[PDB]
Design a protein around this nucleic acid. Sequence first.
RNA 1: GUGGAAAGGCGGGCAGAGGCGGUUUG
RNA 2: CAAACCGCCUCUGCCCGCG
RNA 3: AAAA
Lengths: 275, 272, 275, 96, 248, 146, 121
Amino acid sequence: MDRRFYGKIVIKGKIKAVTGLHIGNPVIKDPHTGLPYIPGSSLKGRLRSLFEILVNSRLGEWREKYPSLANYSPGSCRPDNQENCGKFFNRKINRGWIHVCPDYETALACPVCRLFGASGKESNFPSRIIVRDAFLTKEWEEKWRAGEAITEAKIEVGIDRVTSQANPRTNERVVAGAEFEFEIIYNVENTTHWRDDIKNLLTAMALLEDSYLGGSGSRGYGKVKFIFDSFEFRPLDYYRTGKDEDIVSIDAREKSVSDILSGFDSLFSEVEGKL
Amino acid sequence: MDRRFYGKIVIKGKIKAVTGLHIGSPVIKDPHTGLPYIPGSSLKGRLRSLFEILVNSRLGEWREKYPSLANYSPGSCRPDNQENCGKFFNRKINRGWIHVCPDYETALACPVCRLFGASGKESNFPSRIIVRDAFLTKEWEEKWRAGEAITEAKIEVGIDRVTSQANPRTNERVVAGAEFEFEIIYNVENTTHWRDDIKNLLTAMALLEDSYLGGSGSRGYGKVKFIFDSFEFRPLDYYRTGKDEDIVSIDAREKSVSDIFDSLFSEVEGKL
Amino acid sequence: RFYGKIVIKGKIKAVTGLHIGSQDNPVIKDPHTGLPYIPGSSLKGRLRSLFEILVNSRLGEWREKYPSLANYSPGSCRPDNQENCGKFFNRKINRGWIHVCPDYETALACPVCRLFGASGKESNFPSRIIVRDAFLTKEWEEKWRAGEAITEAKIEVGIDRVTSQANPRTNERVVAGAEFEFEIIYNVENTTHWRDDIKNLLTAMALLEDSYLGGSGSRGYGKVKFIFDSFEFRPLDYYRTGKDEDIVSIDAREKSVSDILSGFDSLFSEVEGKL
Amino acid sequence: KAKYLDLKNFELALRLRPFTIPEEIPYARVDVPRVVLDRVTQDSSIYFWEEIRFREKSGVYFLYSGPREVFDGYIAPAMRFLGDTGIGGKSTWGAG
Amino acid sequence: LGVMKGDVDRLGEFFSSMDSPSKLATASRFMDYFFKGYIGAIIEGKFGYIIGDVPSLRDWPEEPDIVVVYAGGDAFFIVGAWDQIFELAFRVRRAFNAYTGGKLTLSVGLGYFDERTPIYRMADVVSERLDTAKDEGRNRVFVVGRSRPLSYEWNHYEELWRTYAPRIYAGNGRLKGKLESKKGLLWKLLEIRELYVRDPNDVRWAYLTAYLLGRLVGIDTKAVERKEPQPVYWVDGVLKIVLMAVRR
Amino acid sequence: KKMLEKGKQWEAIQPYFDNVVREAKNFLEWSPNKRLANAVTVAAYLTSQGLKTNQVRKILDMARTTELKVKRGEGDIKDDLVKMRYLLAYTVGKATGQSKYSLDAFHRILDPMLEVLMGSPKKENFEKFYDFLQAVVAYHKFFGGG
Amino acid sequence: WEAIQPYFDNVVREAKNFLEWSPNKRLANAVTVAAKTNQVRKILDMARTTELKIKDDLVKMRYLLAYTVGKATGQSKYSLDAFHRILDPMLEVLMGSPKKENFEKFYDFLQAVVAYHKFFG
RNA sequence: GUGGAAAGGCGGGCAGAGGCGGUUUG
RNA sequence: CAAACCGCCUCUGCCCGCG
RNA sequence: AAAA
Ligand SMILES: [Zn+2]
Ligand SMILES: [Zn+2]
Ligand SMILES: [Zn+2]
């Protein structure tokens, strides 16, 4: 009931992978232009699984602020077999357990399934962020015409603990510094609580730059670091005039912890003026 | 009451699958040529579905420009299962809710329904746009003939939050950069409001150009771009004489937000 | 009277899928073989509807060429439920309103009913075209005997605007690219009316190039395309003696817009010399 | 019950001999649904229409006796005329 | 709207065997009184000790909705709720088997019409399907319209419905557990049924059924001993009733 | 025989498994029910072993390409028939494991039905291997392996 | 197996240009060559770069082919004698030729060697 | 001197919501 | 010279209107 | 029309 539209907050920028990365030992690449890419599902799922962990283990500081977390408790339905109990991760996919609210208007109050979307039997809360596949930047198109190593074949040995025997194999991983170009669109469906979702998404980006992205990562395959070009707002009036009548946040140097830093309410104040 | 006809504005161009493009069926493929395509059902129902919510947000701010928006108030009719009450989304399809006005004189003033058409009991408004199926271009027929891959099989997975137990599946999606050739016909049934209908169709095209088309979309499977070729007019006398008497707007290198407007359509104004 | 019969032959090309239906929705098919076909009524009435709307636009501008359009005002008779009160779409058949003239001598001057035929009371002007039924070209029966699919099964869906709930249905559509073989036989009853009747028939065909033919047309199920082979005049003396007196214009590679202007001053110069 | 005998059987049964009926009728009485749409609202109205739909090699015929100048001056031109305007029915739908 | 015609087969041979008027009068009165009297007592819902198991979509109501147009010497013509007519045809057959000693049979042509249909055509469909279900075997039933390269025996259908129906149909218009949300499994099997009419000789319909039940399945020369049709052909009139009486 | 594929069906359904297979050293062996009858018994004793299933679909896509070339796609339908022989053992030339013995019941039936197609009809002489290629997958799904 | 080594030697004497044969003699010689693994990966990965994209890449590929005997010495000269023998005739013709044709036969031979290498030892 | 004359099975409806190619091996 | 697994599930699948 |  009552889906609305106010605008589309657009987050562009780049992803400077500081350490060599491996989504995938073939990295999955674009079949038309050869080059690798970061998929959009691969970023959205890693932001969601690094944010359900933030929510699940801290159910004190959120449940007064987000109702309908009173149906949960820190845990998982992995030991027993119920799809709906007090344990948090309630949906079994087919062999793994992931939090999805099974109702529309519980997901309308949940702090996970109100931003990343949710499934349901005839309930189905659709998402509010869309995450697009990050290809390279044009300053790696121009580094690919020079015939340079867009990837590298690393050889990571497996040492036997008894016979002291080696067992090497080759991983194939994207080169360090390979800077992919992302695109995240928040879809403003309610003017009351978009502060919560945008601060929530920047929390997920901080917990992503803390963590890794793709591959093992424990051995070094992640180290993802966002570099923002332009938050924008694009109100409804943009899609009817087509002018430059869209609110632009300027943070061309700032950091994902610095944008969520004291001054979120200082930078987004024009969006607050436009709602 | 009173259907007229002055001409037919024809929009031609290309649809650029900037990312991959999933429209399920395995992507649909026509049975003869075997290549994938975009239907016109999948595209009209996604221009509509966006302009719906665009109207639903501005539902009170227009009812002096578009009457019969006064007779709605925002939301769905799911929390009170009735057909036609004060809520905007007032038709049940099978178990889901969609705005279609129930009459001819009501829907003649709806902005959604004068452009995408309506249905109903004892009255019926038919559409003004024709959205034809979009097959691959001339270049990509031959890129298929030269041996390239036109689709891909992408492999995704689903990770358990606790033990990192992962569960794969395979999607099948059109490769990025693939380009389909479309056509949209607005049938000028009234010379009072054709500017508003062409401008609402461009609002729906712009909202589609920021959202996705088909498939997962929130995971990257969308991202259509509109590469314009030709607005044409084809007036009432093109069809009788046959001679090239049709007015063309020169927009071969413009954006769907760059058409939207008085400079382009001036001869169509003067031709009335 | 009668002065011969002009036979127009050619092909139809279903450039997009063609759907007509047979009361999970089948298309109509020949009950013996099983192949589809385009009816003659489904083609003729679509031509008549298109030319009705075109005429209703021009009830002010053709009053001197065609009289008895002076007896009609542009509109429809649905609100004031008296038939032929003075609006154009004046006759109600069962629940819908058509322009069909009520007399012979008023329909001899109305350009729709002069060509497509009227019914009236005590009067009955019969039609002046025969839209012959359209069957698959023998190439497409040979493709039908190669095991190739001649119809498809397209699954469409309806979707909730708030909760995105799929509600699917299927339609059985003819495979795009199909070829049918049409014939339209005009009856030369009065040697004045012939130019205007064939020009109006080709105008009605050219509105159908930009419209559709049956089924969900605005969702992309029409796009018919006329590909002419030849015209024949078949004079009065041909039916008397049975020799070869009939003028055969040849327009093998011409479209209906290339036919209305290019051939009407030129490919009918031989027919006007025989009347 | 049977209505039409084959030419060979028919000549049998004219002499009161045992005969066989054909095991197949050469046509089908099918009723197609049609519709009438008003031009403003596309609002429909069905009626049904019966017709005789023939097979691939099948059709219809009739016989003529009498002299040959009547056939050659009257019936043979009449059959070339009526091939392009049919025998009864909705002949503007290309029926007869 | 379910419109059933259908009469007693080869009855003139039976009345041409009576060798007195006192015997003919008895035989004609009993054959009369079955259709005049003991067919309304069926539709009231009686005689279940003799009738028993029948192909039924729903529990038999207290006051059914069936209108008897005619019921006479050997025939009837009955309309009503089109999926209570279905139980009534087999129920009247099971009661006519019992009223006779088993010596006489009846054919039934069935038609399921939209409620607002002219009555000459609504009668000439059923009266043609009775001749179709009658010139074949004179013990038949035309259960539903069907495609073939058409009717069934009675005991054949009631032996099918013991098997194919209670594994997919629960009762009162509801399918079984977990075959719910698999309604498309029931229609696409009728796709695999329709690769059999397109060619009965091609054997592609066996592994496709084995695949689709993995995601009927095997052939037998008991059919190919004399070329009678395969068991995938005798599932249209059993699946198609259950599809028409579950949510279409 | 749904209960066959029991544990000794590998030692039961190899009575004459490769003899008639090598007797079908061309494609158009027998159009009849012998195709399906062989194709059940081929998968009947694969199932007692591993038979990693989803490493086949490249041949399915390749047969789709050759079938589009049947549908007026290319006049040379010879190179893709050889590209399968290029990829005939590269799978067992990539990695081995537990299901290799079922591959022993898979590699012996390859070269009877793969060395044929150099001087063959391109459109014809192909549907029977195209049917055996799917009925084994189908009945293997039906016995419960995939 | 002295008859097969003479058969391979005669086939490499018949291996003149990059368009070797229309028939299975490409595969029939790939069987005889396949009858190491990590030393071919430097060219099997070089086989990837000849598809996405030029002039110096053929010279670099010939140097990487000569690098196989140009790195390993000792008793690795008799078993690596034919590695220079069959392939390099199917590359000297490819100097004055477009890159879209006449290489896929060499590609299919070079990888049908490896495709039957692990199976046939 | 045709059981005829006139009559578009058609209007409206996104194959969609949810899901890190990943866990361990100096 | 890659050891081992997981290789699709969850939900609707023709309606309202003409006779 | 198998006594509708
Ligand atoms: Zn949630
Ligand atoms: Zn509306
Ligand atoms: Zn008129």
